[PDB]
A paper describes a structure:
Structural analyses of two glycoside hydrolase family 92 α-mannosidases, BT3130 and BT3965, together with mechanistically relevant complexes at 1.8–2.5 Å resolution reveal conservation of the global enzyme fold and core catalytic apparatus despite different linkage specificities. Most enzymes within family GH92 are exo-acting α-mannosidases that are capable of hydrolysing terminal mannosidic residues with a variety of linkages, including α-1,2, α-1,3, α-1,4 and α-1,6 glycosidic bonds. Complementary to α-mannosidases within largely eukaryotic mannosidase families (particularly GH38 and GH47) that play important roles in N-glycan processing, GH92 enzymes are metal-dependent, featuring a single Ca2+ ion coordinated within the catalytic active site.
The carboxylate side chain of Asp353 (Asp344 in BT3965) makes a bridging interaction, simultaneously binding to the inhibitor O3 and O4 positions.
Residue numbers in the entry:
A (entry chain A), B (entry chain A): 20 to 576, 579 to 735
The structure:
Amino acid sequence: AGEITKYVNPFIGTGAIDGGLSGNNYPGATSPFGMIQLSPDTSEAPNWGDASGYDYNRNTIFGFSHTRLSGTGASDLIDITLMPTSSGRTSSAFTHDEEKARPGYYQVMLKDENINAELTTTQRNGIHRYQYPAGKDAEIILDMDHSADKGSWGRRIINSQIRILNDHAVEGYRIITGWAKLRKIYFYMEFSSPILTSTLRDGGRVHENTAVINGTNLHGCFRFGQLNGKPLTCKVALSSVSMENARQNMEQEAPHWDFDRYVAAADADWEKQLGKIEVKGTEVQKEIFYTALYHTMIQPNTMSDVNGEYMAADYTTRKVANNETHYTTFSLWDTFRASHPLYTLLEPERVTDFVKSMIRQYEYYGYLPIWQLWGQDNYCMIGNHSIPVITDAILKGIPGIDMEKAYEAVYNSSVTSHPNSPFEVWEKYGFMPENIQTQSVSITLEQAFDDWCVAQLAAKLNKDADYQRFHKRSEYYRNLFHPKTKFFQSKNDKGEWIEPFDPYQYGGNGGHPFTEGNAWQYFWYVPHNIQALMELTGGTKAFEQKLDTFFTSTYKSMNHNASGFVGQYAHGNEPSHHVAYLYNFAGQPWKTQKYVSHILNTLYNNTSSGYAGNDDCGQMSAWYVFSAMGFYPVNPADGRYIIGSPLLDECTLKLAGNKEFRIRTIRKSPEDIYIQSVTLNGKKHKDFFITHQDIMNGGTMVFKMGKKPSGWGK
Amino acid sequence: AGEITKYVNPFIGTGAIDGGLSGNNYPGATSPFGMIQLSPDTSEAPNWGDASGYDYNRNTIFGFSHTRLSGTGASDLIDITLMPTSSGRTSSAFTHDEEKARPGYYQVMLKDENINAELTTTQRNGIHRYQYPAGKDAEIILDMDHSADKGSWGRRIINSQIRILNDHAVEGYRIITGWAKLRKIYFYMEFSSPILTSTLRDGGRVHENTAVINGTNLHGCFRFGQLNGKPLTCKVALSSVSMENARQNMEQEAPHWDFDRYVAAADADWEKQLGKIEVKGTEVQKEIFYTALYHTMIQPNTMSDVNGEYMAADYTTRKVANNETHYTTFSLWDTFRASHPLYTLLEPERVTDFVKSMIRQYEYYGYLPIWQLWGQDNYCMIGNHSIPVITDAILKGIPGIDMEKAYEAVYNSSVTSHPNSPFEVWEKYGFMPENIQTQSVSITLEQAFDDWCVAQLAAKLNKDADYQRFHKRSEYYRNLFHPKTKFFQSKNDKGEWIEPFDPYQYGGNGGHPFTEGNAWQYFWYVPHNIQALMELTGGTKAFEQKLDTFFTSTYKSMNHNASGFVGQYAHGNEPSHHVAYLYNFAGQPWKTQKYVSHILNTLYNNTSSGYAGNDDCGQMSAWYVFSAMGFYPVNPADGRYIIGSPLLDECTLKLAGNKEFRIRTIRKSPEDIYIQSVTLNGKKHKDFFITHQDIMNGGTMVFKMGKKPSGWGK
Ligand SMILES: OC[C@@H]1[C@@H](O)[C@H](O)[C@H](O)c2nccn21
Ligand SMILES: OC[C@@H]1[C@@H](O)[C@H](O)[C@H](O)c2nccn21
Ligand SMILES: [Ca+2]
Ligand SMILES: [Ca+2]
């Protein structure tokens, strides 16, 4: 018990060094792909700098809430907040010295009044256990106002309710706006001891011992008297649909009152999840690796209730079939790159539900998700990056996906214009003109890649006319390639290059042709035709040389999303993430190995500041998981993984059937970062990639490593 | 055909004279107690001065929307707006000369482009017919942004959609805030001719021939080409729950495309409704009377869909039983006085659903409605005036009401404190202190009356302890009766009379102890113990004298809700409405008859400015209906109607069974306003009231009238 789970350190990514963006992870309890993230908030109102609610540099806890995002650069959720107290207090100091976390478990001693808080979860319930000093009164404060910063996104509470049903049960809801336009969060809560007195309020309006209150700024205080020394256990279930659903969620998943038993089931559940990859390496490597793997598995989030009901993207209540689960929290601009490829390896059964969930947005909203939060699109970032995810699953043969319905959704999302996707402009110009559509160069590149995916899906279904159309569109990166400067640059609607152009200059999220990066970084974004890109650059040697400049040029111009620098390579944001693997394509695999190894060893660590930037729903972590094993999905829809440099001594992927993909290394020391040779299933392996089918068949792959570059693949 | 419906003039109450508040009625098509109010908007953004959307003093139509309130002093709804055009225009001039309206039908010639618009409805569908000139293009503009004034109530569109399903079908929705906190309006629309081209937009973002758009500021234009000379018919169904429900609403109620047939069914439906009272009088009287009766029957509004589903007050989707309908639009501060009593006479089957609907708010929200709009409370005005309505129905024996569940709702709404109802303050002080709860005197009086109702209901169910409690509370008006001045006046929490006090001074809706009136007007609000009030005033002669001062004192101090003045009596707002009947209680029935007759003949007319103030969901109209027949529910929960002065020569109420209550007059001329004697079922009638049971038994009542006061009841 705890062989693997003891390696996860939930505090990795919860802080930042001295400036530089936090990982924005949280240390509190959750379950795999769960609905509940039960965690302390170290802010009264979480914002972009502490978007999960927890910041390791802070020393005050303002309550325990039940929902949040992991690693995002904008805050939302933070719903249903409990705080223990003996004297109506709403905050407490704490120290990291008297605080612990592990998969499914969080504990902290609240110092102001010496109350011990422990947290665990099921898929849809949060479970609390609070120990008050003997001789002191036990109270719980319920805060329904506490949320992400109300000065952002037009965020306000439209309406809410707290309703005491009996001496051990409370229910309510909040309807709230924000980064997601409209969310409804219903709850059902029970206590292990009877409520003796209580107070409800809405702002300055206070009602003593009153069974219900409605309003926009609601707070409850429940008083249990002297319980010395019995702990108070609280159970809280949520739903996007109704209080009835939430109650039913509790009846099915959390009927009992054995706290330690919930803790043990969460740990067991996490041991099975993390056990999908058995690794061998140093103790620090296993900590960093299993923590990263944990970060990939805490979302997408369960949205449907145990009865299958969910709020759909048309704001109506719908129901999935009995063997299906509706998911949300799709940070797709990030997660299409590595996280979704990882789920095809470890979570094929869940991938079918992720895809079905994406398709429901098309069905009820008109196009697939761009960035999805609480069952609805918020259009964050760029592209239509459901498309690679859905394409990749289908091409790989992930079972249970209706391919014709999936194609309809992908096709219609690629021809029906919508914000940041003016498709008539796209097909008329063969690029996005900056004066018509901003973030034009980044969109042109990323959308071109989305279009390649559509083409591959059309080819699979024998839709020849569609293949031509979308293949031609996949080639529109060519229309922005400048033949003198050899960068992709912005043009206007007259077909003229905008001048002046500085390839070091950062753009934001509009008002500039690049999205949270510069032209140096976006140059590499032709993942579906690296051969064409190399040719345009002047051939393999010229392409190698440009990569060398990229990795060594230290000019600081600036966007705060960019950090974790290797020259102009910025590991802290995701446009760079595929680039270190590109030396393979240029005939210098040793340089990929050199740079990958440098990033793994130098831009990740096992402290609070352990990621180079925002984790972004586990994308930064997924990069580590992939790269540490020794390969990466450069084109996340072609079913190939490009070999880098294996960090760990061994890795074993557990697959369906009783199959295993066994990765092994022959090395003398940790200096042995260069690949001398590779074998797959006993035959010498002559390519710089392994296929998805090679992995899912089961088999074994051996790397002979060495301290010096060989001529392998060179 | 049209014997009765030809008397209704929908333009009565749609204007105002030269200042003074409009009736705020609308002339467009609707069905009895319907979901759809299909009517032109003469404003871009309706506000308090034109809250239904139509103002008779205006000459431009900005579209035809499908929802509104009748006669309210605040605007909401105004959802789903169509406008015909031949050249993308969004407004048109019109004249009353080329415009018509009658129950279930509205027509207007739009002058700018010579397009004829006709409108009718079913319970849940709006039906349009537009005739374009031969040789001109047919287009429809769909405006999803058009609404009540967005500068009030924090009103904004959270999200919306327009989605073209095929060449003849469009669906969508809007989610919007306002006077009601959150409303979701889903629609399904069909055209009689195929859409040839189209445009959708969200603000400046325009998408040509695109099947769907999402956003907060959406507009569609649909182009049908040259249809000369076939009219374009449009059908539009709504739902509070889903597009599927809306479609199903159309399939059940409006499958066909015969416009004239829809018109005829609406007229037939209205003929049965208005036929519940057959009246004889002058032609002008029948116009004023049947129009008033129409105004009482256009709300409460159907909210549940044909499958029984509705949005409940916890914002969840629920379903009523197959023989039930969920209603909303309960303007209770107004309608508890006369409109709800009228529904007990004419609409007992609907009253059961109204009561069930009120109880659903208690079940899902925690207390009964105060003022209900689109299935939720907005707390407008004062009191808990569901209570008289629910009490009155139960005491009268309206069938199908669960009395124990109803009592639970009434009781819990009377002891669970909530905004404007601090019940612990109430029971500690025996009044509302002005420094703790504003509008204190008006609330004290009205809440005292609500409490009498609870007491009567407790007595009916043999709950003796409850009877005492609420009877004692019904007497709290005594604690604000000033023994020197003989007015009800405000006190502070030390029990001290606030000074100075001016009984002419108007209050608003907070910051003053009276609600949209002065102390002169609120003095009469002890409807449940007029005997006690007369005694406190110094006896019947003193009480008579105070009424005389009230009806003759012309001092102008001012609140714009108060208008239609007879001295300090202000017919234009509803605190005054019972007062002319109080001379009966004082031993001077002839003075009631004098003043009632004066109000009927002088403060109502058959022009656009035909009401003395806001109709308030038919309360002003209900006053006319009752008073013209010759009696009024002074205490709207004791099942007595106080005799005034019958205006009409005859009236016949059609009741269940084949029963009739036949009211007849013996008179020589219209000067004969004074009652000489009364007979009921052939026996001489010695009381100044008739009972509800006397009416519902069927029978006949004869008034001998004369030009001069008799000593009848004197
Ligand atoms: O969190 C949402 C998005 C991310 O998808 C993306 O990685 C981007 O870097 C970013 N900065 C702030 C917010 N975001
Ligand atoms: O329309 C809602 C309420 C009415 O219930 C009431 O008659 C009052 O006079 C009033 N003035 C403006 C709005 N209102
Ligand atoms: Ca990022
Ligand atoms: Ca009024």
